[PDB]
């Protein structure tokens, strides 16, 4: 096994879920970016997706 | 091959002298032998061949090595 | 360890417990009047139980 | 350790376990197909008999 299937284990995923619930933490680099922009409503999270596009083009 | 090199010079102990010890207690440096000692001051005819008719300084040719090879290779 | 978690993979222990609890509850229901039972309650037990 | 690494890979078709899996699947399909071809010959013979009658 490798880092990838360790990070995608049930315990790690559950801890990610609990962290985004309990403290709002979300490493957006883990998650697929929305194809359609308009479904995103928060300015904060839309700007974070914008940051993801920025690091991708870099 | 370039990771695999001979020793051109050895590391100088002058480098280790340039900074102080860091307080690790080694077991072999615990106290021990703490006091110095000081001195006082017919059937044998039928056969064709019967009688009726050291050290050297080379380890490999020494008799011990010959005997050792005859013992341990068979 | 590997062999026994391979046997008990996908939470089979809790499944066995829940199914046997349900079986005993569901057959006690079929004898409720026979045994003069007012109610049979399957309990909401803690998952580690 | 100096052997073929691919003898420890599940996807390697050279492995005897994979060969066995392929072979058993093939035997199931082959037996079914032999049954099929027998009955299809019977269909062909039935057609021939009807044409001989007509």
């Amino acid at each position: 096994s490798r880092n990838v299937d360790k990070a995608n284990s049930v315990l790690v995923r559950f801890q990610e879920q609990q962290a985004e619930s309990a403290g709002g933490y979300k490493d957006y680099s883990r998650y697929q970016r929305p194809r359609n922009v308009s479904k995103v409503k928060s300015i904060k999270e839309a700007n974070e997706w914008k940051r993801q596009v920025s690091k991708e083009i870099k | 091959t370039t990771s695999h090199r001979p020793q051109l010079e050895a590391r100088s102990g002058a480098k280790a002298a340039a900074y102080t010890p860091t307080g690790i207690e080694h077991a072999r440096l615990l106290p021990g032998h703490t006091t110095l000692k000081y001195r006082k001051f017919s059937w044998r005819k039928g056969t064709a061949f019967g009688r009726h008719k050291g050290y050297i300084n080379d380890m490999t040719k020494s008799e011990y090595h010959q005997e050792f090879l005859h013992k341990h290779v068979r | 360890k590997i062999s026994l978690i391979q046997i008990f993979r996908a939470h089979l222990w809790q499944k066995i417990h829940e199914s046997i609890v349900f079986d005993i509850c569901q057959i006690l229901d079929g004898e409720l009047d026979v045994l003069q039972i007012e109610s049979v309650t399957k309990e909401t037990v803690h998952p580690r139980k | 350790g100096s052997g073929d690494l691919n003898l420890l890979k599940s996807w390697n078709p050279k492995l005897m376990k994979n060969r066995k899996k392929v072979w058993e699947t093939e035997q199931d399909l082959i037996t079914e197909q032999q049954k099929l071809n027998t009955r299809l010959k019977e269909i062909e013979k039935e057609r021939e008999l009807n044409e001989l009658l007509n």
Binding site: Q17, Q18 | - | - | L5, P13, N18
Partner: protein, 129 residues
């Protein structure tokens, strides 16, 4: 902790069934759970030559390669996999796939090796004959 640890820590509120259901909802959005290939270490099964740069690749060379399960199956039953490496000199992608019926491999893209289900069923019956 050691390699062979028996127990992992679960928080006191952890329900395994709800956790798996939540992680299943999460898995549909993670990048590395949904990419199209699995990285693997493998040996080159045969001697092959790159077509871009003519480099010879001997058998039993280890590579870091990409594994794809293909849609097609041998006799609609057995899994076929594409195995993709990249050329050590020029980094061009070389691909080959498993051939379960022959219990062998067959070349796909980027390289060359050195030296139909109905029809397959009929051929197998004739082979058995």
């Amino acid at each position: 902790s050691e390699r062979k640890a028996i127990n992992k820590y679960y928080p006191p509120d952890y329900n395994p069934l709800e956790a798996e259901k939540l992680s299943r909802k999460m898995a549909k959005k993670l990048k590395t759970m949904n990419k199209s290939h699995a990285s693997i270490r493998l040996m080159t099964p045969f001697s092959m030559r790159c077509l871009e740069c003519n480099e010879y690749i001997p058998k039993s060379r280890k590579f870091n390669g990409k594994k794809e399960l293909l849609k097609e199956k041998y006799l609609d039953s057995i899994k076929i996999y594409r195995l993709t490496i990249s050329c050590p000199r020029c980094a061009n992608s070389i691909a080959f796939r498993t051939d379960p019926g022959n219990s062998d491999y067959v070349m796909e893209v980027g390289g060359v090796r050195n030296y139909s289900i109905d029809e397959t069923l009929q051929r197998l019956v004739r082979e058995k004959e």
